PDB file of C-alpha atoms and ligand atoms in Angstrom:
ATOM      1  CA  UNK D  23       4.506  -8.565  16.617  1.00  0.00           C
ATOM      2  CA  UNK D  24       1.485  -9.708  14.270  1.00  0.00           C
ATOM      3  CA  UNK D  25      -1.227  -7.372  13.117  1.00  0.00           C
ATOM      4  CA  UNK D  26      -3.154 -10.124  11.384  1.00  0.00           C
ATOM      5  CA  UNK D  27      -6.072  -9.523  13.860  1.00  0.00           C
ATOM      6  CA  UNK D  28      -6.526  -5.826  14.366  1.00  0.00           C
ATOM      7  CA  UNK D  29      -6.583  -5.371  10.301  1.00  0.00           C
ATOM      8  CA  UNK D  30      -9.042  -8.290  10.055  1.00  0.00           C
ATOM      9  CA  UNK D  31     -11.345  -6.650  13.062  1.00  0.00           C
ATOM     10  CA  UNK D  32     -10.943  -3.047  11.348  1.00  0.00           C
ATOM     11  CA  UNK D  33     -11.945  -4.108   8.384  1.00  0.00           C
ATOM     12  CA  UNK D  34     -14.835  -6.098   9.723  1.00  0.00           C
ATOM     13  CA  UNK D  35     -16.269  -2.528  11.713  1.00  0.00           C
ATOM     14  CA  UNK D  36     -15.325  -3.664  15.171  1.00  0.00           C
ATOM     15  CA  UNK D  45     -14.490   2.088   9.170  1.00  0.00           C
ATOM     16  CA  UNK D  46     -10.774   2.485   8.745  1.00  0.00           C
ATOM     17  CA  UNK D  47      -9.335   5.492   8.659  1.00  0.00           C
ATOM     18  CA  UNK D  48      -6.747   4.965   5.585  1.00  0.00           C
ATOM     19  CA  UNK D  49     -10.077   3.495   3.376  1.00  0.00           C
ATOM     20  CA  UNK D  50     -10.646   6.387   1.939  1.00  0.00           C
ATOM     21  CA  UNK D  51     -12.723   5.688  -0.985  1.00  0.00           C
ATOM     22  CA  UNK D  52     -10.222   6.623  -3.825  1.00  0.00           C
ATOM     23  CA  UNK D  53      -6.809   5.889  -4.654  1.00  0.00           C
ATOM     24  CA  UNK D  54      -4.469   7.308  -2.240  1.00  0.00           C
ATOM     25  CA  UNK D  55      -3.695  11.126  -3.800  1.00  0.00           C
ATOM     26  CA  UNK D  56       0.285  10.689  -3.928  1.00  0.00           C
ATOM     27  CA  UNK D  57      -0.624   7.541  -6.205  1.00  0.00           C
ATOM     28  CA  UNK D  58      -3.658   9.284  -8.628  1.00  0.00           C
ATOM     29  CA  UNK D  59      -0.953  11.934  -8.667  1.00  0.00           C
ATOM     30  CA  UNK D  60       1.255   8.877 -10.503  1.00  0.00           C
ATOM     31  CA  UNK D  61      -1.275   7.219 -12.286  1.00  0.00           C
ATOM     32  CA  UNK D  62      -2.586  10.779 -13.975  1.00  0.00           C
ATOM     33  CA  UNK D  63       0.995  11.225 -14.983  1.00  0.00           C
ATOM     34  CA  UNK D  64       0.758   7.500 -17.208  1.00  0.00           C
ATOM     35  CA  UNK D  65       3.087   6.139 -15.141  1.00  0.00           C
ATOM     36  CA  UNK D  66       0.645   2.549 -13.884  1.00  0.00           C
ATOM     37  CA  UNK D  67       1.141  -0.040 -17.220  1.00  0.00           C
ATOM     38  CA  UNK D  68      -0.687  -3.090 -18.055  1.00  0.00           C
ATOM     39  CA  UNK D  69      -1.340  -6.152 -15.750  1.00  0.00           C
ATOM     40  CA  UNK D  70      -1.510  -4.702 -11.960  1.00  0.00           C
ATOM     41  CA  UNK D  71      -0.448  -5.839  -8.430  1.00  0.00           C
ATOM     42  CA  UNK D  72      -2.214  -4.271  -5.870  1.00  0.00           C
ATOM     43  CA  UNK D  73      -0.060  -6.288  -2.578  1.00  0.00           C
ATOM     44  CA  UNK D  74      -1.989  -5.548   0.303  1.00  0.00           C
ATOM     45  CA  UNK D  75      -4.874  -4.107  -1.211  1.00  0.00           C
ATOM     46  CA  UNK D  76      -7.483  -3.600   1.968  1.00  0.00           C
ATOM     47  CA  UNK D  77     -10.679  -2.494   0.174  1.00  0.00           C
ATOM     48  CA  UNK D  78      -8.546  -1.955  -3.267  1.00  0.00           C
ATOM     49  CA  UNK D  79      -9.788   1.590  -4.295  1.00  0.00           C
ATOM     50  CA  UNK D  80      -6.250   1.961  -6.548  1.00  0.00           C
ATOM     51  CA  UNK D  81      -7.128  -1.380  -7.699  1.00  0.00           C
ATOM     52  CA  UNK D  82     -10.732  -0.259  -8.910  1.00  0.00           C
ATOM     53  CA  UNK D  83      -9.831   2.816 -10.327  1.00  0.00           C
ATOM     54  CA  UNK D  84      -6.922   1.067 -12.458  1.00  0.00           C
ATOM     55  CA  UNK D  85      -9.970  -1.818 -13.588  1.00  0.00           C
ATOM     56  CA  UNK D  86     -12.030   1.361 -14.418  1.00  0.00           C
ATOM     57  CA  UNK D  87      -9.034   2.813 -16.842  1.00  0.00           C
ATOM     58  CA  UNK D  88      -8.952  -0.721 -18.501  1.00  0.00           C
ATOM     59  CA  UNK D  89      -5.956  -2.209 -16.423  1.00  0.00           C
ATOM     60  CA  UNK D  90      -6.540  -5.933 -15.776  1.00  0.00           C
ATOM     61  CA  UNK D  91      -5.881  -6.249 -11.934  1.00  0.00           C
ATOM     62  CA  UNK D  92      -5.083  -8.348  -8.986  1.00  0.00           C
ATOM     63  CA  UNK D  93      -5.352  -7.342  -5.625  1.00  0.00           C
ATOM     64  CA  UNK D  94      -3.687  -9.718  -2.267  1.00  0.00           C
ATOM     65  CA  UNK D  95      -4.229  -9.009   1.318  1.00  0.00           C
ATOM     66  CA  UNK D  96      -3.388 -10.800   4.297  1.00  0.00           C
ATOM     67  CA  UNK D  97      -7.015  -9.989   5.456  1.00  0.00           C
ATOM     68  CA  UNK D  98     -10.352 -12.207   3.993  1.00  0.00           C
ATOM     69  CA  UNK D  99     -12.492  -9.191   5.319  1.00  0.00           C
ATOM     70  CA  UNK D 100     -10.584  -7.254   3.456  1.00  0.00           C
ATOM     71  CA  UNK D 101     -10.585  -9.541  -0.162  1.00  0.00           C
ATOM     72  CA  UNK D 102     -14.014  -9.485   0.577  1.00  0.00           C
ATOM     73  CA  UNK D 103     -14.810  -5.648   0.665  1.00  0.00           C
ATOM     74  CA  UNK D 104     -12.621  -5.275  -2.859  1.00  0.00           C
ATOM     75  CA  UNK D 105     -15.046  -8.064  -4.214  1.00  0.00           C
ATOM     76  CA  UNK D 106     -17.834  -6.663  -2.990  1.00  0.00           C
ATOM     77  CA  UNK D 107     -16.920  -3.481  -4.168  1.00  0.00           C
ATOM     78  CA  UNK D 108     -15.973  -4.235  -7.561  1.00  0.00           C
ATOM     79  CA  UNK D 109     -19.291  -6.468  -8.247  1.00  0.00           C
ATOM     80  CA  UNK D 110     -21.274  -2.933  -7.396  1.00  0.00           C
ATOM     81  CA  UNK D 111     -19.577  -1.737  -9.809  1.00  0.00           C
ATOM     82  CA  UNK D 112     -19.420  -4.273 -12.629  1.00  0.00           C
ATOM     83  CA  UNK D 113     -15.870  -4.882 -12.539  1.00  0.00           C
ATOM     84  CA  UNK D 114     -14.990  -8.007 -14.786  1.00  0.00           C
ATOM     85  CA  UNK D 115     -11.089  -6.518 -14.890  1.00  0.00           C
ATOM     86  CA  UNK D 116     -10.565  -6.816 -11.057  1.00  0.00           C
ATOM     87  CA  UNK D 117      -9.250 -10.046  -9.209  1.00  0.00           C
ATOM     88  CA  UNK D 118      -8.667 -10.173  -5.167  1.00  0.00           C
ATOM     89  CA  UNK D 119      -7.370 -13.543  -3.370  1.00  0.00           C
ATOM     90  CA  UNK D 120      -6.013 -13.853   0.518  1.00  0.00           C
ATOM     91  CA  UNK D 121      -2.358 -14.416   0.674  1.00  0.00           C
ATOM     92  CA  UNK D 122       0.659 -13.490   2.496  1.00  0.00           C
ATOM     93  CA  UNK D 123       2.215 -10.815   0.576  1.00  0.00           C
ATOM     94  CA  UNK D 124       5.485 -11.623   2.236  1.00  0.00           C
ATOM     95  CA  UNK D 125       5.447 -15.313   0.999  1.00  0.00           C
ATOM     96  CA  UNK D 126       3.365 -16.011  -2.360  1.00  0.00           C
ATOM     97  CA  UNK D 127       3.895 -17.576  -5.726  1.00  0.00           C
ATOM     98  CA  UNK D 128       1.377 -18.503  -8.875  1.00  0.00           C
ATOM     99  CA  UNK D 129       1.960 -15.223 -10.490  1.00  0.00           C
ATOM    100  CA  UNK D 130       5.173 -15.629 -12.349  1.00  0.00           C
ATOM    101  CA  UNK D 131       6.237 -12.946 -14.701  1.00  0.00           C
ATOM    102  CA  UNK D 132       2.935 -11.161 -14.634  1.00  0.00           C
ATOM    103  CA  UNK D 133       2.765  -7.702 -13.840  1.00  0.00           C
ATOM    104  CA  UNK D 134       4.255  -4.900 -15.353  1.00  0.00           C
ATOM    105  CA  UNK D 135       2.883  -2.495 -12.458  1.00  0.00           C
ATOM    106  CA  UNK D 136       3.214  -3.154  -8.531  1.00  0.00           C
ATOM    107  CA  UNK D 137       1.657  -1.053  -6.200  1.00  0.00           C
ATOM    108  CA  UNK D 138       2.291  -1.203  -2.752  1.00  0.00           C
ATOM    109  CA  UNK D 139      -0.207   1.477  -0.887  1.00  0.00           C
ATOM    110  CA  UNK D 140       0.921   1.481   2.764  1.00  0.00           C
ATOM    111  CA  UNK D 141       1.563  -2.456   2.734  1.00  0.00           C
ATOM    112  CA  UNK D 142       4.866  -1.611   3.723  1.00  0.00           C
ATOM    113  CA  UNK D 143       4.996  -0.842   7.048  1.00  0.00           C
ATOM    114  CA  UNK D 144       2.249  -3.174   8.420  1.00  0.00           C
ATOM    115  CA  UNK D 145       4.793  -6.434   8.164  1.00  0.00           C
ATOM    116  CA  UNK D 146       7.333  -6.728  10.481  1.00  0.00           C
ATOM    117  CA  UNK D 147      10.994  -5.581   9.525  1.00  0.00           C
ATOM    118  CA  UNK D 148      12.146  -9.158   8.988  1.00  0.00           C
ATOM    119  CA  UNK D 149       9.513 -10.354   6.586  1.00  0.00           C
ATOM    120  CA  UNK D 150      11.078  -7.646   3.981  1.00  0.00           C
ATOM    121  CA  UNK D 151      13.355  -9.759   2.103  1.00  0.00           C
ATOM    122  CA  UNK D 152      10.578 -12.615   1.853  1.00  0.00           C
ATOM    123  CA  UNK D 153       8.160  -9.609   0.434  1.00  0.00           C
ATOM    124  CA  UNK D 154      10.500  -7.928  -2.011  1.00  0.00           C
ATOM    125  CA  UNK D 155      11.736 -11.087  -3.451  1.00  0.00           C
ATOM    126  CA  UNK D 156       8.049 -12.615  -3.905  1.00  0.00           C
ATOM    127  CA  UNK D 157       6.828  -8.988  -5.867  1.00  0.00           C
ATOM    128  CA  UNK D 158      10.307  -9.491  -7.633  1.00  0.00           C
ATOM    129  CA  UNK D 159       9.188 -13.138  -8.999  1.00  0.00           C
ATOM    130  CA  UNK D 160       5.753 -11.955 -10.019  1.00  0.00           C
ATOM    131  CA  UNK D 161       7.345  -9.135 -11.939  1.00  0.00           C
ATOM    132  CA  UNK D 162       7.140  -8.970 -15.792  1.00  0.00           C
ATOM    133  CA  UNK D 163      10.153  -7.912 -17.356  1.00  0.00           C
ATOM    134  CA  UNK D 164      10.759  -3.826 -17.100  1.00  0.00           C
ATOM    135  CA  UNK D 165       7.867  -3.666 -14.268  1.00  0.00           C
ATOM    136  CA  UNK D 166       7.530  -0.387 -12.396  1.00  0.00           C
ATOM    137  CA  UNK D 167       7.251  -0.669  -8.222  1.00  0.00           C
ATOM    138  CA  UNK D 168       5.675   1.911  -6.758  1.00  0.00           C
ATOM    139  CA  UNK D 169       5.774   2.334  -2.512  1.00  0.00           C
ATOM    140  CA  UNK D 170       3.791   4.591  -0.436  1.00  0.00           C
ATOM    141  CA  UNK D 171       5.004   4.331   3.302  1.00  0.00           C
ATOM    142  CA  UNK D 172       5.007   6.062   6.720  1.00  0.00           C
ATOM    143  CA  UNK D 173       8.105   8.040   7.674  1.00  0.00           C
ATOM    144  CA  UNK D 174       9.926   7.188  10.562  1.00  0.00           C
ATOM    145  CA  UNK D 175      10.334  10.474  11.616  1.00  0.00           C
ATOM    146  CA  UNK D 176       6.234  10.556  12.155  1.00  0.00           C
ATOM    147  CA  UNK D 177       5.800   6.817  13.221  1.00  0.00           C
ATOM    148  CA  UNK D 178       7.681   5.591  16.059  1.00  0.00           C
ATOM    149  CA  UNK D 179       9.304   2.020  17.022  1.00  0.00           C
ATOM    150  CA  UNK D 180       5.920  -0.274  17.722  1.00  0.00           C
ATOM    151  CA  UNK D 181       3.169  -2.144  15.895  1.00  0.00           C
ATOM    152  CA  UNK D 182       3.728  -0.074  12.448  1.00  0.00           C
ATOM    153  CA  UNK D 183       7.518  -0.367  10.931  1.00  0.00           C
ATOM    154  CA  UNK D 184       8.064   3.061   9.740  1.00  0.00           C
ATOM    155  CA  UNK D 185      11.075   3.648   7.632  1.00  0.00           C
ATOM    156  CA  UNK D 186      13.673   6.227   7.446  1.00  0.00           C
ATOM    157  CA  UNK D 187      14.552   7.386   3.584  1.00  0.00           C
ATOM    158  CA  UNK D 188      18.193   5.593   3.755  1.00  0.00           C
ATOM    159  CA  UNK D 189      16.478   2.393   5.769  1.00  0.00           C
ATOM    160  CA  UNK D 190      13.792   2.268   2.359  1.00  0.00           C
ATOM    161  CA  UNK D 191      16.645   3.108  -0.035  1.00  0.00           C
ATOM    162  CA  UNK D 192      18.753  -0.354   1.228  1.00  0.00           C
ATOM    163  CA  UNK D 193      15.881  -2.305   1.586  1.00  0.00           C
ATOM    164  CA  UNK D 194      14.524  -1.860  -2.070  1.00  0.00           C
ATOM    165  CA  UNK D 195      17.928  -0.891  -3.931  1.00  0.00           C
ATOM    166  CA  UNK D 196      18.999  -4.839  -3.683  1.00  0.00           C
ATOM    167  CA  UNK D 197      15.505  -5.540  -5.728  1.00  0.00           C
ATOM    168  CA  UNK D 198      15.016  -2.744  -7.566  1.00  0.00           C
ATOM    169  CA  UNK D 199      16.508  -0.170  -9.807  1.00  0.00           C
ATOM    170  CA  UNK D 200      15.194   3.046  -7.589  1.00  0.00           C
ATOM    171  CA  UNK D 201      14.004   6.231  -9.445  1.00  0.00           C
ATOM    172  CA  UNK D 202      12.932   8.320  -6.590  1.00  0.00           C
ATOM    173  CA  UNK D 203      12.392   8.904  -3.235  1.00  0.00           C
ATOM    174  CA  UNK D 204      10.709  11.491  -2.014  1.00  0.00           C
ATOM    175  CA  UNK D 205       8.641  12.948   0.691  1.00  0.00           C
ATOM    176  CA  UNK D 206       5.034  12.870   0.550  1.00  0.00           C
ATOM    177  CA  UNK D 207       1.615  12.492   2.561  1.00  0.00           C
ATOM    178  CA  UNK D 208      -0.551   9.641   3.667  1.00  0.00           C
ATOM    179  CA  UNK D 209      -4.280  10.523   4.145  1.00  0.00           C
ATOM    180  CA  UNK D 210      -6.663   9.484   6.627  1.00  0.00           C
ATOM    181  CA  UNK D 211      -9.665  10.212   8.114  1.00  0.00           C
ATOM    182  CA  UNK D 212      -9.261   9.643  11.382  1.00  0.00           C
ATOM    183  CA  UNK D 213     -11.722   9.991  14.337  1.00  0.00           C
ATOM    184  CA  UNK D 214     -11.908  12.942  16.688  1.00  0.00           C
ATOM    185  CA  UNK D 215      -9.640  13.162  20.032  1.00  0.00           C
ATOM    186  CA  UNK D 216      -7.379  10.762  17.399  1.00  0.00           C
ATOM    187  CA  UNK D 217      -3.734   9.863  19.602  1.00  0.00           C
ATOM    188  CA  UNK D 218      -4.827  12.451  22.027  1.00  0.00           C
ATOM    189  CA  UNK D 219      -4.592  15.771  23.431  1.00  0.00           C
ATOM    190  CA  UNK D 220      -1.933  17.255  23.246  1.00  0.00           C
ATOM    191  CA  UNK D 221      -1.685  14.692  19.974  1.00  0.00           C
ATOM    192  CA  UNK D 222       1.163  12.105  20.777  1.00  0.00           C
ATOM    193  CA  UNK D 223       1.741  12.411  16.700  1.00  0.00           C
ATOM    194  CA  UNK D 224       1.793  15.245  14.281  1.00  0.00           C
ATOM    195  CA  UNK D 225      -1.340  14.458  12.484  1.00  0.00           C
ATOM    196  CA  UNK D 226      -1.563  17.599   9.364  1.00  0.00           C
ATOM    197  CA  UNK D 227      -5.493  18.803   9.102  1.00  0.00           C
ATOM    198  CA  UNK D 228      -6.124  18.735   5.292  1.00  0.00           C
ATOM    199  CA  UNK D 229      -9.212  20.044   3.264  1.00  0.00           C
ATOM    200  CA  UNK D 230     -12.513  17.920   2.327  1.00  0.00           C
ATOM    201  CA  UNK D 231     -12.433  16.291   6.037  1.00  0.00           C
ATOM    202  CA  UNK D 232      -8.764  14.525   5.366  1.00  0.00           C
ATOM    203  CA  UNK D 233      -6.019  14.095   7.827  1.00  0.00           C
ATOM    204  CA  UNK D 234      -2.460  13.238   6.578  1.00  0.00           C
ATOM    205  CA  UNK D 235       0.859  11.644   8.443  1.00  0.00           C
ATOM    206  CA  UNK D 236       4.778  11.995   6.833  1.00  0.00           C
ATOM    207  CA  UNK D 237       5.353   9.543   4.648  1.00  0.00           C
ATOM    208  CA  UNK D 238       7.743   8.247   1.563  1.00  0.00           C
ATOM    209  CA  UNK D 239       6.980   7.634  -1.557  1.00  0.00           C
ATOM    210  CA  UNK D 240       9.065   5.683  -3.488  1.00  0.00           C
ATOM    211  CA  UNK D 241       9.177   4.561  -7.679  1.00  0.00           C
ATOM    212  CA  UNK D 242      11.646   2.346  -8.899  1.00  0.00           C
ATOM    213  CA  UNK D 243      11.370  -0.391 -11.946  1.00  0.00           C
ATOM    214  CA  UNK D 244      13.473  -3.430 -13.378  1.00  0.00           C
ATOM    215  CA  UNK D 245      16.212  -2.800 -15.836  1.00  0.00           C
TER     216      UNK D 245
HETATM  217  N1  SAH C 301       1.802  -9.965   5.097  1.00  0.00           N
HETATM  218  C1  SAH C 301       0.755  -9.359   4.521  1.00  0.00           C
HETATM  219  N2  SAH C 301       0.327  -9.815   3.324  1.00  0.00           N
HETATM  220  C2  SAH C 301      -0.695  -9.194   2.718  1.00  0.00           C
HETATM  221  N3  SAH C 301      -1.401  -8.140   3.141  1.00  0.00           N
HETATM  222  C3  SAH C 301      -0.953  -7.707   4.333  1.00  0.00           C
HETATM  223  C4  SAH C 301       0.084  -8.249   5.074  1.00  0.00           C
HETATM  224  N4  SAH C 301       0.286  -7.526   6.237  1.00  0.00           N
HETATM  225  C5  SAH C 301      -0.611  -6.574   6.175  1.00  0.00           C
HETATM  226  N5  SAH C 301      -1.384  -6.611   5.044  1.00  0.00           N
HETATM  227  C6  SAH C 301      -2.388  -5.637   4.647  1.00  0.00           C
HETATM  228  O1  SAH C 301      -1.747  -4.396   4.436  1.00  0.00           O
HETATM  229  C7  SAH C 301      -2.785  -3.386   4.460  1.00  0.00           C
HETATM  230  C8  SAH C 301      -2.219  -2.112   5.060  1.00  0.00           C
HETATM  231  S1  SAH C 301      -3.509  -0.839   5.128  1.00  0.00           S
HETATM  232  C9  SAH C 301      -3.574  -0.228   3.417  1.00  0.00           C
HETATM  233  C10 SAH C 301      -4.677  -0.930   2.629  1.00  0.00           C
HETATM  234  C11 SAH C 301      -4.798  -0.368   1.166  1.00  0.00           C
HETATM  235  N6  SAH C 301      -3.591  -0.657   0.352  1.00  0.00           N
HETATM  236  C12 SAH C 301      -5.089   1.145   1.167  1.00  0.00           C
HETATM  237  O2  SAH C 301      -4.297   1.949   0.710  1.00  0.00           O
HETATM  238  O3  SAH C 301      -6.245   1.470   1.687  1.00  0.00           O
HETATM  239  C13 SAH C 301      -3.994  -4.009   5.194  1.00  0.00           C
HETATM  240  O4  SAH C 301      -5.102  -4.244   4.316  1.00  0.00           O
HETATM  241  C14 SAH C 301      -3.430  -5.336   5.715  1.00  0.00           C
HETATM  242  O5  SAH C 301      -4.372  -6.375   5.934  1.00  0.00           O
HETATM  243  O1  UK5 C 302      -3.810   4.283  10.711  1.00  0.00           O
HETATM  244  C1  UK5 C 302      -3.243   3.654   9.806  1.00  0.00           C
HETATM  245  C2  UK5 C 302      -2.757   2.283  10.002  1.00  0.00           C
HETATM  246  C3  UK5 C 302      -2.154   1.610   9.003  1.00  0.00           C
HETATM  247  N1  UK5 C 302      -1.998   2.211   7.792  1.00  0.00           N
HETATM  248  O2  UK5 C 302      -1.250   1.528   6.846  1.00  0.00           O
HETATM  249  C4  UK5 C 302      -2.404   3.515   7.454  1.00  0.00           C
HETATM  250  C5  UK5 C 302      -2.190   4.098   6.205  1.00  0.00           C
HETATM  251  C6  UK5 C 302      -2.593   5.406   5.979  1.00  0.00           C
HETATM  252  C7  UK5 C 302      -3.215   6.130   6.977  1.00  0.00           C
HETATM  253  C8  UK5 C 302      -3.453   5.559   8.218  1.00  0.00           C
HETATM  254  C9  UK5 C 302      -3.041   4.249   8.475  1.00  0.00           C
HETATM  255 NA1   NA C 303       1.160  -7.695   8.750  1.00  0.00          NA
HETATM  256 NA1   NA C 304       7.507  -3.348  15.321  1.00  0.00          NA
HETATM  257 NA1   NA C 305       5.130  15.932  -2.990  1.00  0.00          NA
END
């Protein structure tokens, strides 16, 4: 019912598959298209790489996970860098405040799924608050169809469509793929899940992805 410990031991090495070390391609794919804009929320960042890439382009940005492992790693990672644009803090992404009016960007890269159903309404209305007027909102999450009923709360298109609609003026949903690389023998075989092979060592799962702003 809580993942709060199996993120902060994954994180910790006791690395994930879904840190990839760069942005999560359905999300470059947005960003090379113009479509990330000014001050940027990162909500649920893990090890942030969409959050140092964006800091890289000259976005000011502000990463918040759940997990202090994983604020850490984005720290870490942007002071190897020499990152002065990129901010991380621990907080519930489900029930924060202090950033009134902020961003004009919110990225939410697989966050989604990994609170439970209920905690929704807290979530969207806390990303809503620390929206700048005309802010985009941008989701990446696992498809239903793919991830069944259990720890992660995969959504079905019309399930993502009511959830955000009473937030958010929605732009798009469409299918798309979540990358991973995942270990070998990963969910068994025969594979309990439909994992796709992809090139450069990847592995991907069904997903949504999602873009909608205020208006
Ligand atoms: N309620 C919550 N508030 C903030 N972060 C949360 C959270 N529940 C889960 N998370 C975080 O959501 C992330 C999902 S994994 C994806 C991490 C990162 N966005 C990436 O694309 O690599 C984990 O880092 C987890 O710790
Ligand atoms: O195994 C995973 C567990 C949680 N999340 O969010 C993922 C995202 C992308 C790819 C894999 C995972
Ligand atoms: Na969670
Ligand atoms: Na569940
Ligand atoms: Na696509």
């Amino acid at each position: 019912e809580s993942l709060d410990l199996e993120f902060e031991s994954a994180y910790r090495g006791e690395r994930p598959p879904w840190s990839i070390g760069e942005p999560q391609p359905e999300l470059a794919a947005l960003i090379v298209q113009g479509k990330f804009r000014g001050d940027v929320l990162d909500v649920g960042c893990g090890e942030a790489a969409i959050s140092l890439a964006l800091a890289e382009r000259g976005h000011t940005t502000v990463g918040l996970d759940l997990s202090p492992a994983a604020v850490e790693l984005a720290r870490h990672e942007a002071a190897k860098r020499g990152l002065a644009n990129a901010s991380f803090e621990v907080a519930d992404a489900s029930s924060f405040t202090g950033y009134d009016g902020r961003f004009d960007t919110i990225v939410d890269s697989t966050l989604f799924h990994s609170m439970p159903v209920e905690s929704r309404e807290g979530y969207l209305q806390s990303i809503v608050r620390a929206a700048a007027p005309g802010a985009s909102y941008f989701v990446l999450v696992f498809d239903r169809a793919a991830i069944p009923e259990g720890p992660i709360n995969a959504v079905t298109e019309d399930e993502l469509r009511a959830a955000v609609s009473k937030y958010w003026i929605i732009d798009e949903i469409k299918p798309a793929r979540l990358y991973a690389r995942f270990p070998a023998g990963f969910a068994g075989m025969p594979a309990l899940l439909d994992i796709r092979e992809e090139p450069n060592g990847l592995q991907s799962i069904g997903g949504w992805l999602l873009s909608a702003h205020l208006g």
